[PDB]
């Protein structure tokens, strides 16, 4: 059922856990570095887990998609064909920016954080900068021990702060991926949908130095020896059975003003969905004619597709449950309840008014701010602005450098510049520049940016063409030129005749001012947000409702049972799908073009010892009433005995609006069954070496 519970809430859910069927003790789940919780790792943006004592890590195909795509070319397309390393020396690097984070310690820092904030006094900008300074110090202290990365999390609008310390594995390798037609069976058609028939898995291996310490990729590295790893279930998972997930959900907005919901539904999602669908169309059309553009853009395209469809589905779910009306009524009830408390409600009523005003300030420039951000996120403008900003930051002492541009961020920056080689084609990026220039030009006078208007020197199709022709003269298209500029100094950027660098130099002062506006708004938010959100929480508890913080990329637990759901009267979705359902969808065309070995094996009823006799087949995917979101892709699903029974990978269509208003009847996790991972690796795209390593051979 509902709830992305923090580990500290375990006492509160221990009862519920027992009642839903957990047979492990709550103490055993409390130990976040023990068995089995210590096997759960952040990737992040996704979750994963260890599954062998020699550092094998299982996650979803969508989570490894970037890695697979980085190792693919038009001629040798691992997204399409799969990958399998027969021995660990055949494993390929997942990319310099790939990471496995293993949890080491969580520390409550709430009191200190809040004291650092109060010390700033009345000024909003100073308040932001005080919290930044606190965070940077804390993190520097925590990361003094070599091999560890730390992160500061704010919960419940700034009412609680915790510091996480992780071991940071920096040499992640691809060990196995099923072919794309298994990994992403049904593609974007079946994404966000049940019935689902998707082999949504892949394997990495984590590596460290011979001294046991994290290191970047080197042939002298060796597999990491995890303290804990998961084991596959020996009992067949069935309808009604207990399941739990631990992982790293990114963000939810269940605590939000009505107006923040209204702006999101009425403007944010439709705008972003439109821009994304427009970019998809161009890249799709271009890739039909150029298989290099098709492979290099595939991961970008997977994300545009996934997010735009998600937003379409949220808009549809809001209408299904009248989310606008629920938010309006709930807020009118909270505001009544506050007014009724006289004196002591006033600070929350005041915080509400201040939050609403801050949203209005945001809103006045939203089109400008979005359009500029996305124009500047095309590949060459993005490279030039990032690198020029790095050069500005490098002239300051490290502790005063903007987060993302400190010494601790240089590996990521550099790795990004290298990875882009596999994700950029000039002729494609040009069409994306043109799209964004055309969108910029539609902005009204008061949403335009002087620097960009001047640089453009016109407001029509001729001017756009002239600007694109100018930018096409950049040399940032090559990896080596980008790294040259990664190390260069500010004056070297300001002297350049590289047209993308010139753009960055021209707009930078404007980006910096906009950043200051955002920092300022954020400082006012730091004052008002905790007070209102606490009231929201207090109201929810007085109503007997579940109280848990919105997701914020930190470790959460969710639990429940395997069960279907009913989309409409006269119909139910069953909890499982089956192998015969995969073949029923075969068309021989992407995304319904399963490997021939799959089609043959099902036709011959080769079930590989994995048949669940209660469904008459090997199970493929299943539904459960767990509470997961973006970030939970790849999270292990565990049974009553803490054994692996699948991996979380998606939500059903109606579930996605739960990011704003939770609907228990239509919110389900979609998970890929452990048995289907094993089945594919036996009968379809075999990996006997992995099955043996996981003691299922």
């Amino acid at each position: 059922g509902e709830g992305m519970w923090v580990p500290q809430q375990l006492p509160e859910i221990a009862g519920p856990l027992k009642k839903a069927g957990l047979k492990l003790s709550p103490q055993q789940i409390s130990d976040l570095t023990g068995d089995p919780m210590g096997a759960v790792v952040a990737l992040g943006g996704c979750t994963a887990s260890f599954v062998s004592p020699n550092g094998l890590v299982v996650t979803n195909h969508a989570c490894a998609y970037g890695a697979i795509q980085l190792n693919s070319t038009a001629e040798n397309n691992l997204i399409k064909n799969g990958f399998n390393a027969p021995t660990t020396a055949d494993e390929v690097s997942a990319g310099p920016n790939a990471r496995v984070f293993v949890l080491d310690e969580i520390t409550d820092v709430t009191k200190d954080a809040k004291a650092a904030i109060a010390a700033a006094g009345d000024d909003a900008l100073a308040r932001t900068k005080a919290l930044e300074a606190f965070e940077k110090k804390l993190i520097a202290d925590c990361e003094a021990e070599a091999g560890f990365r730390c992160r500061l999390y704010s919960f419940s609008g700034g009412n609680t702060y915790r510091l996480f310390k992780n071991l940071e594995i920096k040499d992640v390798r691809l060990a196995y991926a099923p072919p794309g037609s298994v990994g992403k069976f049904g593609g974007d058609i079946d994404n966000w949908m049940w019935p689902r028939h998707t082999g949504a898995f892949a394997f990495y291996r984590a590596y460290v130095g011979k001294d046991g310490k994290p290191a970047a990729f080197s042939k002298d590295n060796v597999p990491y020896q995890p303290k804990h790893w998961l084991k596959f279930a020996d009992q067949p998972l069935g309808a009604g059975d207990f399941v739990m997930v631990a992982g790293y959900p990114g963000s939810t907005n269940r605590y939000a003003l009505a107006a923040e919901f209204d702006n999101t539904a009425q403007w944010t999602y439709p705008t972003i969905a439109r821009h994304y669908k427009n970019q998809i169309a161009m890249v799709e059309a271009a890739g039909k004619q150029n298989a290099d553009i098709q492979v290099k853009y595939a991961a970008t395209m997977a994300g545009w597709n996934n997010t735009s469809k998600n937003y379409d589905g949220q808009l549809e779910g809001f209408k299904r449950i009248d989310a606008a009306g629920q938010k309006l009524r709930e807020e009118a009830a909270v505001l009544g309840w506050l007014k009724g408390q006289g004196a002591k409600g006033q600070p929350a009523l005041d915080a509400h008014a201040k939050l609403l005003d801050l949203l209005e300030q945001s809103k006045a420039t939203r089109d400008r701010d979005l359009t500029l951000a996305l124009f500047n996120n095309t590949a060459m403008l993005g490279s030039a602005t990032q690198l020029y900003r790095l050069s500005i930051e490098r002239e300051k002492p490290n502790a005063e450098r903007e987060s993302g541009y400190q010494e601790r961020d240089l590996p990521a920056i550099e790795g990004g510049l290298k990875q882009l080689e596999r994700r950029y084609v000039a002729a494609m990026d040009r069409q994306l520049q043109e799209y964004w220039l055309n969108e910029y030009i539609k902005l009204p006078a008061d949403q335009r940016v002087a620097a960009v208007d001047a640089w453009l020197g016109g407001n029509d199709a001729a001017a756009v063409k002239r600007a694109l022709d100018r930018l096409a003269g950049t040399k940032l298209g090559s990896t080596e030129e980008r790294l040259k500029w990664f190390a260069a100094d500010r004056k070297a950027f300001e002297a350049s005749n590289d047209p993308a660098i010139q753009y960055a130099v021209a707009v930078m002062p404007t980006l910096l001012k906009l950043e200051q506006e955002r920092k300022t708004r954020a400082g006012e938010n730091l004052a008002a947000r905790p007070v209102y959100l606490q009231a929201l929480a207090d109201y929810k508890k007085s109503q007997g409702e579940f109280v848990y913080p919105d997701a914020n990329l930190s470790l959460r637990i969710t639990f429940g049972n395997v069960m279907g759901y009913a989309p409409k009267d006269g119909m139910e979705y069953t909890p499982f799908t089956t192998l015969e359902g995969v073949v029923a969808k075969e068309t021989g065309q992407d995304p319904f073009d399963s490997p021939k070995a799959l089609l043959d094996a099902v036709a011959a009823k080769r079930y590989g010892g994995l048949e669940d006799k209660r469904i008459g087949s090997v199970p493929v995917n299943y539904l459960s009433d767990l509470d997961i979101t973006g970030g939970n892709a790849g999270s292990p699903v565990l049974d009553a005995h803490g054994k692996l029974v699948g991996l979380a990978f998606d939500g059903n269509w109606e579930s996605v609006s739960s990011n704003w208003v939770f609907d228990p009847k239509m919110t389900r996790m979609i998970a890929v069954d452990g048995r289907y991972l094993r089945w594919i690796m036996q009968e379809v795209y075999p990996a006997p070496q992995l099955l043996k390593e996981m003691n299922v051979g």
Binding site: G44, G45, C46, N60, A62, C63, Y65, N191, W192, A200, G250, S251, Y276, G303, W304, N306, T307, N310, I628, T629, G630, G631, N632, A633, A648, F649, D650, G651
Partner: peptide, 6 residues
Amino acid sequence: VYIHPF
């Protein structure tokens, strides 16, 4: 799929 929004 529940990867991070893009």
